[PDB]
Write a protein that binds this ligand. Structure first.
Ligand code: H9K
Length: 263
């Protein structure tokens, strides 16, 4: 099959470029560059809510990561500033985020930088966790390794990452998912960082939910955020319990409209 291995770089996505196959016209994302770990972790991954890794090629000092193209773009761009998005859309995206995070944690991988810029959407609006550049193995040979490195983006980091020397990996990803859920429902980030010097963070711990972003959020998803955004990571809700929450299991969204005729 001649020219089947030839890909044309047609546009920049985020360096990340959209590549189109010369013969088949298949669209892929290619990332051009810690890096050895990123490729290793990517080779472990296979899930419908995790951006697919096709392979890698090294041209001297440049690494080319061949990854799944997500035409829907970033979840970030589905969030209307100060508004968010319809609650059924946010619930569906939150379900898909949980399936992807359950998968990652199940194989002992923590993403460490979950935010809407890293949550991509395919052609059918299916959420895909992306960018495994900060990701690490927290469970190996069924032995959990406690983390100590500062990783992430301050508005999304769990408070234990700033207060404690060591912390468990899984509650940190759970916390950032709750900040993502907040962003989806209110179109704003609740604080700059989860610290006592942050008035907004201090107000949330004081249960001042009559303030923004919380007053824009319905009591059923807000009750879930009350269980996720818990300062003590040991008292914080786990994903198996998130899956039992009332809003998580609340019927809200119809399926993808399917073509139909009458009479
Ligand atoms: O380890 C990594 C590192 C990076 C990624 C990765 C994989 C795919 C993409 C990608 N695929 N499709 C898109 C993007 C960015 C984007 C941004 C847009 O505004 C629109 C589309 C896309 C971007 C980054 C996945 C795993």
């Amino acid at each position: 099959v001649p020219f089947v291995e030839d890909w044309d770089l047609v546009q920049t996505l985020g360096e990340v470029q959209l590549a189109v196959n010369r013969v088949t016209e298949e669209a892929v994302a290619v990332k051009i560059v810690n890096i050895k770990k990123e490729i290793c972790i990517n080779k472990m991954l296979n899930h419908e809510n995790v951006v697919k890794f096709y392979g890698h090629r090294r041209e001297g000092n440049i690494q080319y990561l061949f990854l799944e193209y997500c035409s829907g773009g970033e979840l970030f761009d589905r969030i209307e500033p100060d508004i968010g998005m319809p609650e059924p859309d946010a619930q569906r995206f939150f379900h898909q985020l949980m399936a992807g995070v359950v998968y990652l944690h199940g194989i002992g991988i923590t993403h460490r930088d979950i935010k809407p810029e890293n949550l991509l959407l395919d052609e059918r609006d299916n959420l895909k966790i992306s960018d495994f550049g900060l990701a690490t193995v927290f469970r190996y040979n069924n032995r959990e390794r406690l983390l100590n490195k500062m990783c992430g983006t301050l508005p999304y980091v769990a408070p234990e990452l700033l207060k404690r020397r060591e912390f468990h990996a899984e509650p940190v990803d759970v916390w950032s998912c709750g900040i993502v859920l907040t962003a989806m429902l209110a179109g704003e980030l609740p604080w700059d960082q989860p610290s006592d010097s942050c008035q907004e963070y201090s107000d949330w711990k004081e249960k001042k939910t009559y303030l923004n972003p919380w007053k824009k959020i319905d009591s059923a998803p807000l009750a879930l955020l009350h269980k996720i955004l818990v300062e003590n990571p040991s008292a914080r809700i786990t994903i198996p319990d998130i899956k039992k929450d009332r809003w998580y299991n609340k019927p809200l969204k119809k399926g993808a409209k399917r073509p139909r005729v009458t009479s």
